[PDB]
Amino acid sequence: VQSETVEPPPPAQLHFMYVAAAAFVLLFFVGCGVLLSRKRRRQHGQLWFPE
């Protein structure tokens, strides 16, 4: 019933991946977001094919 085994610490699968995915997504959304903030994002008539 002892406070040393009444909890586990959090899953370091999710927690340590949180730091990875947060850093990847931020670093993507800002790095991509800086240049995309001028224009570029037409989609449709520029969606891999120009049509």
Side-chain angles (χ1 to χ4, degrees), residues 3-17:
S3 75
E4 59 110 77
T5 198
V6 96
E7 313 290 344
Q13 179 189 89
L14 286 62
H15 220 115
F16 193 103
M17 169 152 65

Side-chain angles (χ1 to χ4, degrees), residues 20-31:
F24 186 81
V25 176
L26 175 62
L27 174 80
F28 175 86
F29 155 60
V30 169

Side-chain angles (χ1 to χ4, degrees), residues 11-48:
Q13 179 189 89
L14 286 62
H15 220 115
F16 193 103
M17 169 152 65
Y18 271 120
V19 195
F24 186 81
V25 176
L26 175 62
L27 174 80
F28 175 86
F29 155 60
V30 169
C32 197
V34 77
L35 58 97
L36 289 193
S37 293
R38 197 180 259 163
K39 54 181 180 203
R40 193 52 55 64
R41 93 312 177 269
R42 308 302 300 179
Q43 212 260 346
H44 179 269
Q46 201 196 222
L47 192 58
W48 165 265

